[PDB]
Each structure stands twice: as C-alpha cells, then as structure tokens.
Amino acid sequence: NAINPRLTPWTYRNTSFSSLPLTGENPGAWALVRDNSAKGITSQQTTYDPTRTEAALTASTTFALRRYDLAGRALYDLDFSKLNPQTPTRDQTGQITFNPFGGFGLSGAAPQQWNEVKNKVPVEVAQDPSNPYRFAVLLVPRSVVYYEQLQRGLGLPQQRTESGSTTGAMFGLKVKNAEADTAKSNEKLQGASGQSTQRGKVKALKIEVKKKSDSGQLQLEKNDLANAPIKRSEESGQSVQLKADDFGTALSPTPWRPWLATEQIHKDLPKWSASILILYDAPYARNRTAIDRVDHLDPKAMTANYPPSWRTPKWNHHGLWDWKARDVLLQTTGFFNPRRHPEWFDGGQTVADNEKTGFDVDNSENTKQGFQKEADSDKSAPIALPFEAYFANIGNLTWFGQALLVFGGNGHVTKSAHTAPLSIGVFRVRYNATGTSATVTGWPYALLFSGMVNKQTDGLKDLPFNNNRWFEYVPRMAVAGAKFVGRELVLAGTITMGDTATVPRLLYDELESNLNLVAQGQGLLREDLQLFTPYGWANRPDLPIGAWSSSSSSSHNAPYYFHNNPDWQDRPIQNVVDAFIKPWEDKNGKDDAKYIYPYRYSGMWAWQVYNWSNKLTDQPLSADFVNENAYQPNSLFAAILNPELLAALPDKVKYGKENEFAANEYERFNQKLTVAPTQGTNWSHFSPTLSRFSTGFNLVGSVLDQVLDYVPWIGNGYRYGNNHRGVDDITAPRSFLPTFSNIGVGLKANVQATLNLQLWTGAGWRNDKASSGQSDENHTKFTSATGMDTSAGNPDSLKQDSGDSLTTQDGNAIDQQEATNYTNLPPNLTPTADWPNALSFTNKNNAQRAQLFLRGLLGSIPVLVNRSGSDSNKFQATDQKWSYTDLHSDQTKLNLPAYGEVNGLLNPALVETYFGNTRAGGSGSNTTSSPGIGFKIPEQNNDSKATLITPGLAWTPQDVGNLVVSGTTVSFQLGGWLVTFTDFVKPRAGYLGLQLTGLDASDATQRALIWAPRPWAAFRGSWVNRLGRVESVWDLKGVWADQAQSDSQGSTTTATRNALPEHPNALAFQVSVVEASAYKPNSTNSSPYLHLVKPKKVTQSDKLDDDLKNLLDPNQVRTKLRQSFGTDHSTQPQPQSLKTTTPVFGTSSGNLSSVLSLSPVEKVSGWLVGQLPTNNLAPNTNTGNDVVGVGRLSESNAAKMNDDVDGIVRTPLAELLDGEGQTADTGPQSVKFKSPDQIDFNRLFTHPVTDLFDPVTMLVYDQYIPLFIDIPASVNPKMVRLKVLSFDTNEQSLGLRLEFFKPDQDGDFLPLLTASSQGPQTLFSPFNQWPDKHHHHHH
C-alpha cells in the first residue's frame, strides 16, 4: 500500500513549493501531498496551547512526499510518521553502498533522534547536485502548516478617547506637545551675548562631555548631552508616555506575543524546530529508500551570530541625546524598537516601550545617565528569533558543494493582517566530505549585505541600504528564492530598507498639529512611505534637547533650531561660511567640546533623507545615521551572492569591541564612525558576500517617475499617469494630470536661480508674476516667500541679515555687502517638487521612489481624501479642474493638498486614477457611477479634515512567489504582477531592466482575484515553460467562497469603535487638518502654494465625520469601488482556477537606444506617451505591452480552468494539476528489452561482459545494441542507446538502462520507462558462456 489515495498535492505558502521536477540520472518528481480534507486546528475565541495543538494535529492530519516517474505516474509515498527507515551503509572510502538494482546498503538501524522528528511534515525537497540519489528534505511542526487558523492578530494601544480627554487622536495614538521644564531652565545650552540679533568664539552652541580625574570608572563630571530643558507633558497627574501596558495585560485588550519564545523552540528542537533530513532515493532499486541523518535548524544558531548591539535595540550610537530627543517627541527610541517591530521580540508587545534600554536613562543625577548596566532586573529585551519570525525564515533550500543553504520564505506561513514576520538571515547545514557529520549556523542579512555601495547597482542610487559598525540597519526579506543563473547565485524578493518616513523630526510643540508623522514615529502607523507634513519639522533632526529652547525665551532657538524652511537657509558663499562655521570648524576635536554653528540650515524631503538617512555611498559601513528600520518590505530586491564564500564562511561569527555601543557617554562623544576590525575577529570577512544588487529597473529616479506613470493601477486598469500626454498635454502654456511626472505640468522655466537647464515646475507652482504683468518669473523672490503676509512664511520671526544687505551685520574685515539668505528661490516646494539644481527644495527622492514602485504594483499607495462619497459628502467632477487655463487663473481648483498626502506624487491625480470622478462624470451610460470619493480644497473659513485611505486591495509586500530562471533573467510573482529582471545577471545598456505582466481588471474572473480579500491565498506557483515564458497558476475556490460571505455588509465598527479590521492594508491613519486660510495667497505672487501649508492643531472637535472615518476600514472603500464596477450577466459555471502566461516580448522591448540616440527624462516621457492608446474599468487593447514591456494579460494568456488547484506535480515531460491528467510518453512502446531466452545466445552470451561496453562512455557498443533489444525497422537505431548501470566480472552480469532520444538531434537521451515491465532497467546474465548450437529462426 505504497500510495495513500487519501493524500493529494498541496502548496506550502511560505515558498509557493508544491513539487520538485527531477531531470538527469534519477528523474521524475517529488511532490508535497497531504490529507486536504483534514480540518487542521479546530467570534468569542480561545487560546490554543502549543503542545496540545501539535498533538491534536499529529492525530488528525496526514502528510507525505510522493515520488513520481519521468512520465508523471505516482510510484510511492514517504509518510515519515509511518516509514521505518534505516541508515545507509558506507564502503571504506565513506561512499554510500549503492547498486542501481539492489539499491542502498541498509544498516538495520533507524537514524539518530528519528522517533522524535518523524511526526514533522515535509514542506520542501532539494536534490544534491553532486549526488542524484541524495535529497535534503525540510520538515516543520504540523502547527506551522496550520498557524493561520490560530487567528493571532496584533492589536492597538488602548485609547482614553476615540475621535471620528481631547487632542483628536485615533486608534490609541498618544499625542501631546512637549513643554519647557521650568526646574531644568539651567540645562539650556549656552552660546560661544549682545549685538547681532540673528545669530548667537562669537556665536555657536557649546556641548561639553568631560569625565572626573578623581572617582568600573569615570561616573562623569559634565554631560551637556544629558541636558533636557524640554520634557513630556502631564495628563490627569501622570506624564504622557509610551508604555508596554498600553497594549493590555498578557494572559479585553490583549498584547501580541509570539506563540512560542526563541528558548522554547531551542529547548525542544525535535518537536518545534525546522529540520533537514538527508534522504536517499532510487525508485527502480530493491532498497529504494535510506535516511542518513537529521539536522535541526536551531533558532539560537542564528541569534548567536546577531551583532552585539541587537541585545540593546532601544539604544543606538547617538546614545543619551537621541534616546531623550525621541522619548520627549513620543517616538520610539533606538534602531529596532519592539513597538515598531514586536515580531522579533520574545515578549512581543509586552516590551513595546522606550524603557529598560540596557543603559541608564532616568538617574536622579544627569552625570550618572548614559551608563551601561549589569544586573538582571533593568536588562533589555534583545532582538531574538521567536516562532513567527523563525518560521518566516524557513524555506528555499539551495545547495552549493557540501553546503545546504536556507534563505527563508515570504513570511506568509506565520503572518497576521497587522504583523510582518520576514527572513532575517540565512541558515546553513555544512556537511563533511562523506556526509557522516554536519554543522548548523545562521547569519543575519545585516552581516551578509554589510559591503553595500552605490556602484553595485545599475538602478536607483543613494537608497537606504548603508550600515555601520553597530549594524543599526536590519535588512529583512520576503524571499522569492535563491537560484543559480549559469554559475551566478541570485537571491531575490522584497526587502526592508532603512527608515526614511520618520527621519525629519517635528518641533517639540508641533506634535498636536501633525498626528500622522507622530503615529509613524510611535510604532502605531505601520506606513513606511514618507508623508507630506513639513511645516512643523525642525530645520534639522540631529540637535539635542539642550539646543531646542534658549535662555532668551524667544520663538524656538533660531538660527540653530527653528521651523524648517528652505527659503530661510543661508547661502554657502565664502563670507557666510567664514563668519558662522570656520571660527568653530577646527575646534570640534579639542578640549572635550563640540559646536552647533550659527549657520541657518533647512531643506525639504530629499535633503532631510540625504543628510540623516542610511543612504548608500561609495564607502561601506559609513552610515552615521540609521534612523530606524522599515515596518514591512518596501523595495523590490535582487542580489548576486558569492556561493564559494557562503560554503566556506565560519559557523561562529567573532564580533569585536568596535561592534559594541560605548559603555558610557564620554567614550561615545569621542567615537569614530569607522573603526578597524580588531585582531582575531571574522565579522569583516562577510562583507564580500554580495557582489551586485538590483531594485528593479535600471533607471535614474526622474526617469523612473516617467515609467511609474505608464503602470496601470491593478484595481481598475487605469494608469497612474491618467494617460497624460506630457509635453503635448494642455496642463502647460481621455487625459488628466499624472501622478508622478512633472513633464508638461506647470511651466518649463529656464533655471539657475538659487545656486541652460530647462526644467518643468510640476503642479503646485509658486512663480512670481514679475514687474511687467505678462511673463511669469522662472523663480520665487525671497521677498514674496518670507514676508509676514501666525505667518507660514516666517513663524519664528527671523530677519534679513557695493549694494548694502538688510542690516544686522557680523564680524570679519568685509562685515557683509551681500545677504546671508538667497534672493531667487525655486518656484515649487510641494510634494511634486523635483529640482536637480536644488537638493534643498526637492521633495521627490529615490528612497521614496523604490517604495512608490513596490506599492504601485501592489495597488496600495495611500490617497488623501476629505469627501466620503456618501450622499451629502460627495466629490463631483465640477469640484476638479486640470487645464492650464483653469489652473493659472485659480490653482486651488487643482485640489493639491500639499499637506497630509504621500510625499513625491500629485494626490488629485491619484484620486482620479482610483475613483475616476472626472471620467465617470462624462457619460450618460452609467451617469455618476463613480464612488464620489476625493479631496477638495476647503472654501470660506471652513476646515478640511482629511485622512489618508487605501482603495481596499489586499495585496501585501510579502506576496512574493517562487524565483524562476529563463536564460539570463529571473522572475517572480509580486502580488498581481509577474516581475522579470531582464537586465541584472547580464545587464544591457539602454534597457529599462524589468518586464511587468499584470492581472486584467476588465475580465470579471481576473477582477475577482485582484479584489479578493485573501488574494495571495490563491497563488499556486510559477514555472518557466519550454518556450521560456513564465506560467503562473491561481486557485479561485477561496476567492468565490470569500465573495459569498460578507462580514462588513453594513459595518461601521471603525467609525464608532476606533478599531481597525483584520484587512492587511488597514493602517492607523490620523486626521490632517488645514484651515481654508492656508490656501489663500499674499509682492506679485497670488499662489496658494507660495508658503508651506500651515496645519491646524488637532482638538477633539477636529475629528473626522463617521462616514469618512469608516473609509479607514479598507473593505468600505472596496465595497464602493465594486458597486461602481457592478455587472453580473454570468453565463457560468464560474472558473475555479486560472493559468497566466507572460507574452512573447520582442528584441527591442524595453530598449531606449532609439530614443536615447531634450533631456533624457524628456525623451523617455515622449517614448512612453507614444505608447499610449469613460468606463470604470480600463479596456485592455494590448497597446500597453510590447515595446515597453509593461502591461496587463491579454485574454489568450489568461486561461480559465473548470476545476480548483491545491498543488501542481511537474516532471521534465509533464505538468499535472493536482497530480492528475495525461501521463507523458518516454518512447515508442515497440522498443523493449528482449527476454533472455529470446536473445541470440552465440552472438551475445558468449562474450565476457567487458567486451560489450565502452568503459569510458559506459555505453554498450553500437554493434551489440540490436542483440539486447526489440526494435522495429521503422525506428532509427541511433535514437536508442544502452547505458551500463552495473557489471560484475565474477558472476558475468550486466545491468542496462534503455534510453530513447528527444530534441538536440544526435531533454536528450531519456530512460525508456516501457523498456521492461519494471521500468527502464534490467540485469542480463550469465555472460562469458561457451557456445550453444545456433539460435532458432521461426518468427
């Protein structure tokens, strides 16, 4: 009873693995099989004990590995729970005892630690490339397979309000402006005090850190970085503070905790770890099976190699000033705080606060703070590897030599709607030469990717991938796989970049006016995208609390610390630098002091990110700033890795003292960014692992914006560009303004201005009209921008400092004759701003673009709205204008928020892609079919109470399929897009670098999948077909079942209960409030975007209306959009599965050479505009495909199938959906081995065995082939060969395999399965016989 007919194929979600096709010497397939009708783990709810759950699962579920032959016929099952395996014997050289007929030599004994690991279930197989009969089998506990049935979600912090006390906070956000501590007024930093009013030796801020030369050691005498004249505020006696208690007590609000702690898995490795067993397999042999050993992937093998700083992730190398500055601003402290990342903490949310950092943060003496501690009580929670994060890292086996590598999976195995468990590193099982012993290790990706520099990529530069000696950047992946492309090892999937969203730091008294940024910094709002709320930012985020106040008790502490405004910045001319920087510059390394220059700094999004994010440079381990780490994967990622180094690297990482944070504040002050790896360490030996990397396209940022506009939004098929004709559109002096491009938007201005370049302003222009009344200036005068016409242009009341300047002069022998500020400023500082000539005024940036691209494919880019689309609060097409004639006269008709939206895009353009208010409001057939959702500029004295929302698609950045290879390209399914890296392994000049094939929303079946509440639950894997096209299969039974049951039928739970649904893209967004007066302009400048948009401080009364807060439940938006598509004329019986195939792309597809042969951004724009061809769904005409390489599936490439799919069995000759269908042919059936008695005795058995075959080729000589086999005259003898499997000169036996030819023209030679009743092989004997008396001829 070899085949258990109760078991059928299945697909492991973490890797998309169902079967492994086997070619070569031991062909056919291995397939995952299980009892697909078992319920698994079996709304009031209950808590499931792991031990009991696993035991219940062992008794109620059945799993096996099913062996298939080359034709696709099932041979036998290996159910490890019922198998009685034996270890194979070896010979004197340590090689496995093996004969192709007898099989493996068996020892009579089961493997060591067998009966404790036998109940684990197989979820992957990888064939040893150096032994076709050897396989690595990955086994996991049954509980891991059914983990999603436990419904262990992550919850919100308990709120003492609701909105939608006071402050208008939603979803438990703690927000209150910080206040001046009157008892710590002396702790204000002091300058160097008279004449010159705009600056402060002569005028810098002094910071001193000095130790006692008297009375471990040190204990400190003075620590100016401990100073805090500003503190958190009180609410009902107690001070407003982040507490792990906010999530409830562990045993209604329950904190999220891992199902099993790291130590619980470690202490019961046979029961709870993932294990690699070594299996021997030979389906045509007598002893067909043997199991050598089992090796456990102990999570502690990985944690033992974690950088030492990971024991203390609430701390960073900036130490006390940074802990204090973040804590006072109601942010999380350190580089990997448990409030943002509870998945990697054994305590989960029970340790989610800024307390117990492993360093003194609250001593009664300031000079005792910043000290590293021992004890057992106040010791930190370390980055660990608990149940969910550990099993996220289990999958994708890759062999290289004697090393078996485990890269991890996409994290779907243990994911929850609001958690993001991912792969933190790579495990390795390194076997010795004979396979009698092995060693197990894990190394984090932080350590493996530690040599990253800009020149390693052909795509986006300056991306937040840089690191430092402290390993503050923690890259984590949703892994597609690790595949060999020729000899090159390619690792790909999605990755978490360093945090950029919370790099700008708000002024201590600006928190209550900027709730979204506070929420992102707090760990509440799990949004990695940069949001556009700059008015309240501090001019720079790297100043200590001592620099925030001033003994002069004026509006903040300008020029040092003030409201960020690039219009107020000092120009770096020789005299400005000489006066304010140079008298302090060469003193920062003397008598224990550091200085904050009286130089006025400021800049927009690209500038904040350039200076204080972990941007890649040309030098590795050079990130002086690693703000934090992303909540979720937020970039496409592919890396070429050195496999020889992976195979050879040591098991135990030896870190140095250079990797540890300083033991006190004195040593930290006198720290050096780059420090030499110390003697006896090996951590630096891991930096050469990664040789090259990709983030998708091979384009510069501003060119990628053009391509992003060409991409359709998978939700309805409309492009982010809204079919904008670029330079040939009517948005400059069928179509709408684009989301990402500035080309043909606003005016093309001849620039130089600040410090010829023909550049487009984009939407949100603020150009001065000029003293003529006709031609609009190519800039904004500093006069127009900074005037008091409380004031957004100058809230801190700064003043202007040979034609004389504007008084308040300084030192030197020149004293001034030129103003410190610039006179001509760029005419755009809104989110669409892209100034290559001015980093200080640019908002678009590569760190954002890499995210916008990934989110653009998933369809989850947030959109800012203030109209719910309900009858009364509807957005109408009459509310929106786009033509340059309409916009030059009145730019508020554009509905550009320039506050609250996603940075680096045009929000009303995005509103239009999603909701189509303009296009739907332009036809009789439907008429107001649009959901009526949008953002309208507030009128009169009315306020706009806006929120970011997602359109309701449920695709996540962990929706990553298996990695497939085709020529020199690699592909994987990312959400509803099949992504192919055409220019990574072998990059070609002038090629875009990616191919994109998406699901088609115009087809009802594909639309049902695109809009499914669990769309990734449908994925059944990709594979490359014989023609090199990528095929993907989708199961639709779950789509139809989920569509048949609506939980949110008329739900208003988000609006009334201040809670989020279990939708994967439900985010804790906050209200963004702007008064109509902010959109009123000012002297020849009538632009509503002249000043930075000044928001309103949020109070209880500034809450969203219920119908708008209800759109924060993404199913409510989804309901509105599906009503708009609304069509059910179904001919039935409804497709149950779908097979998609990538189209054939031409030789010139993606090639820009013909347009790159007008700036490059302008040429790319025109090329894309030339590739452009009412309704709520865009029709698929197929124009948007070939030439570009970006498009939606044609009808012919999307095959609807009548039955559902759980697993797929593939051999080199057959593809069997659920292991069923037509079985392939290995030959003609008429070609077969002769029976011994039918052989011409004198012509064949008379020879000794060694005469009959070439020992070099191991083939029977052509002259002897017809004597062994029956071959009809119609069949060519060259197509048949006899491979020698065995020979024995003692017994004169000869073991042969009959092989038949296929395509190259003499796969190639394949085993002829129908050769004999038993298969393709047979033993012939005895040879070396004395002659008989002629073979009879009767026929």
Author numbering: 60 to 101, 106 to 227, 231 to 258, 269 to 276, 283 to 297, 301 to 336, 349 to 830, 848 to 869, ...
Authors' own words:
Crystals were obtained of the M. pneumoniae Nap protein P1 extracellular region (residues Thr29-Asp1521). This P1 construct, empirically chosen after many crystallization attempts, excludes the predicted N-end of the signal secretion peptide (spanning residue Met1 to Leu59 according to the structural properties prediction program Psipred26). In this construct are also excluded the (predicted) transmembrane and intracellular regions at the C-end of P1 (residues Tyr1522 to Ala1627). The structure of P1 consists of a large N-terminal domain, with Asn60 as the first residue visible in the X-ray and the cryo-EM maps, and a smaller C-terminal domain (residues Gly1395–Asp1521). The N-terminal domain of P1 has a β-sheet propeller topology of seven consecutive blades or β-sheets, each with four antiparallel strands, except for β-sheet VII that contains only two strands. The longest intra and inter β-sheet connections cluster together creating a crown-like structure on one side of the β-propeller opposite to the position where the C-terminal domain is located. In the crown there are 13 disordered loops, spanning 117 residues, which could not be built. The C-terminal domain contains only one disordered loop (residues Thr1483–Asn1495) and has an elongated fold with the same unique topology (according to DALI29) as the C-terminal domain of adhesin P110 from M. genitalium. In the crystal structure, the C-terminal domain is anchored by crystal contacts and the density is clear and crisp, while in the top part of the crown, with few crystal contacts, temperature factors are high and chain tracing was difficult.
